[PDB]
Every structure is written in C-alpha cells, then in structure tokens.
Amino acid sequence: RKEAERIEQKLERSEKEALESYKKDSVEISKYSQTRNYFYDYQIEANSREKEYKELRNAISKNKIDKPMYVYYFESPEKFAFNKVIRTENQNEISLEKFNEFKETIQNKLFKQDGFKDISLYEPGKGDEKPTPLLMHLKLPRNTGMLPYTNTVSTLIEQGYSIKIDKIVRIVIDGKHYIKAEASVVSSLDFKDDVSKGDSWGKANYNDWSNKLTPNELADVNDYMRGGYTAINNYLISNGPVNNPNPELDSKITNIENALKREPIPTNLTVYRRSGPQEFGLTLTSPEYDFNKLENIDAFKSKWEGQALSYPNFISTSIGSVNMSAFAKRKIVLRITIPKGSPGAYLSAIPGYAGEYEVLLNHGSKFKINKIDSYKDGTITKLIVDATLIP
C-alpha cells in the first residue's frame, strides 16, 4: 500500500480531487468514460462528469510503465460477442463444448477496449471478488499509464486500444472453473472527440494528395465531393453495373478508386460513420430499427455480430466520433478500424465542400463486425458497431 502512497504524491491537487470522486462513484464514472465521445461537442462540455474525466485521464498518465506488464481483470463473455453464459454462477464446471464455442467466437478478431478499468497484478484467488467465469490476462505495452491507489488497494488504467485473444485456458479457482483469456494489445490512431487534432493529422497526411492525382482522377474526385456521390453510390447500391450499365459512371468509379489507392492510410486508423438503416437492410419505419426494445438489439446482434458488412458504394466516414447535425437522429455508429496500407484519403484536406473531417473508403469494402454495444442518447438507444476493414 505504501507503494500506492508513492504514486498518489505525484498527482496534482485537481487530479487527487478526481481520484477521490472516483473512489466514491467508480461505476458511473467508468461508464461515462466509455461513451462520452459519441455526443455533440456542446453536450460533452456540458456534462457534469467531463472535467473530472479529463483530470482522471491526466492522473493516469502521470505513471507510465517502463516495461510491458501483465494484468488481470474479470469480463463478461458478452464483451466479446458471446451472448450467453459460459456457466451459471452457482455451477462449478465449464463444459468442453462451451470452451470450444468461446474459442471459435473470439479467434481471429480484434476488439476495441475503452474507458477506465480497475485491474490486479496478481491472479485472483479464493479471497477475491470473481463476478464472471471469464478472467482476462492482458499484456499491457511499455509506456502504458497505470495508477495504483488506496481505498480501504487497486490499480486504474484507461483503455484506448484493441485487444486480441491469443489463447484460452480452463483454470480452477476455489473449486470453480474459469476461462482465462490470454490477450495482447493492438494499437490504432483514434481521435474520438478531438476533431481538431484529427484534422491536423488529416491535413499533414493529405494536403499534398490532390496533386498526386491525374487530371481525370482529380476531376472525378471533385465531381464526387460536389454532389456526384449520390448518383454514383445509388448506382453501385442497386447493382447498376449489371442491372442498368452506365459506362460513364463506371469510369468515375474507377478513377475515384485509383485516387484512394494513391496514398494509402499510413497507420492503423479508427474512423466513425453514422449509418442510416438502409446500410443494414432496414428502413426508418422498420419495427426492427427500434433499439429501445431489447428483442430488437438481440435480433440485430444475432444477424450482424461475427458477420461481414459489405458496401458496394464508397463509404464516407469521419475521424471524429461526435454526433453532428447532418446525422443527428441516426441510431447506428459504425466504428471502423482501418488497417495500415488500406485504400483511403482524408478528403477534408481539400478546401471547399469536403464533408466534415472526412475520410473516404473504397467502394466494395467489407467490414467484419466484431462486437455491438448500445448506449442512451437522451431516451433513444443507439448502437456502436465495432468493425474491422477486411483487406
């Protein structure tokens, strides 16, 4: 505990203040840290928990590990899209069938992790709170912020990365079976609500992009951004190249694709799209689109989690996660990890009518849906779809 006393002395008074509050209200504060960035900028600024979020975020950055460190924490199976129990809480055994099913569910997938989390440095034993049958054993990389603190002793981190589960093992603690998931961190540039910082990145990486394009490519990209996108994307969505061929539109599509391949996304990058229901085969009047009903979330997850979402059209995204007037009522936030080397361009590097903080992805792109979350925006449940662009 005297070790935790050391690190607390390193904190500013305002950070100590945020930590005192965290000790009293950890659940709500951690919940806020997960979804804060999905609201309007003015909503973020207005929230009573925002100032303390920033202070506590700063506090954790005051102690960065010098070498990688393994940590333990319990997690719900639902966190990795296993939407059923591994075993009940009064059961001791986990069946081998269930073990294999969970392995099949999690393999070859990256999962976005966000928000404040309490962890332990030691494997939980008999005298520890073990609320689920799933124990994460995660390797945190060098320079990860870590805040040990006393309450009556724990360690606080802020998750801002993706994890992959490399191996699962069935272990026994106090006569009970648990799945222990050995996991690794995969990084991705993620601006979340900091659109200004994302814009600085976008401009730095794409200011010179227009000048790398041929006259035909430039003209077709300009025409797309000026409003041609509607005709082009509707054509692609309806399978026009087959059903009602337009070779003029086809040539534009070819040029825009080649433009997006000209300077590939230079690093793993997270982007955000507010999707309309049509992108998932629904309409505004679809009863299934009412995510305030749990059965509709259940049905949506069953259809889409673990499956590929395909876009015949070009995909407009933003480096910012914030809500915006243009898509205020859209209920589905597609949160996409773009692997380094993927086609794409920051279009808002061209001054004019460029969309807001816009990154355009190539037509025909496929997105693997890893996990679906929900949150309340006012009284309306909205979804966050954790997806990876498939090469």
Report which residue type is found at 6.
R
Binding residue per annotation — 279? yes
Question: How many Å apart are CA 353 and CA 314, to the nearest integer?
Answer: 17
Give the Cβ contact number of residue 288 at 10 Å. Answer: 16
Domains, the chain, ranges and CATH?
1-189 (3.90.176.10), 190-391 (3.90.176.10)
93 annotated to bind ligand: yes
Encode the chain in three state secondary structure: CHHHHHHHCCCCHHHHHHHHHHHHCHHHHHHHHHHHHHCCHHHHHHCCCHHHHHHHHHHHCCCECCCCEEEEEECCHHHHCCCCCCCCCCCCCCCHHHHHHHHHHHCCCCEEEEEEEEEECCCCCCCCCCCCCEEEEEEECCCCECEEECCCCEEEEEEEEEEEEEEEEEEEECCEEEEEEEEEEECCECCCCCHHHHHHHHHHHHCCCHHHCCHHHHHHHHHHHHHHHHHHHHHHHCCHHHHCCCHHHHHHHHHHHHHHCCCCCCCCEEEEEEECHHHHCCCCCCHHHCCCCHHHHHHHHHHHCCCEEECCCCEEEECCCCCCHHHCCCCEEEEEEECCCCCCEEHHHCCCCCCCCEEEECCCCEEEEEEEEEEEECCEEEEEEEEEEEC
Solving technique: X-ray
137 is in an annotated binding site: no
Q: Does 170 show up as a binding residue in the annotation?
A: no
Is residue 211 annotated as involved in ligand binding? no
177 in a known ligand binding site? yes
Rounded to 5 degrees, φ, ψ at 134 are -120, 115
Evaluate whether 121 touches 71 at the Cβ level (below 8 Å). Answer: yes
Token pair in block for residue 273: 């799209």
Q: What is the distance between the alpha carbons of residues 62 and 16, in angstroms, rounded to a whole number?
A: 12
Let me know if 147 is exposed, middle or buried by CB neighbors in 10 A (0-12, 13-18, 19+): buried
313 annotated binding-site participant? yes
Confirm or deny that 274 is annotated as ligand binding. yes
* C-alpha–C-alpha distance, residues 186 and 111, integer Å: 9
Query: CA angle, 222 as apex, 220 and 223 as ends, to 5°?
Result: 65
Check whether 363 is labelled as a binding-site residue: yes
Q: What is the resolution of this structure in A?
A: 1.9
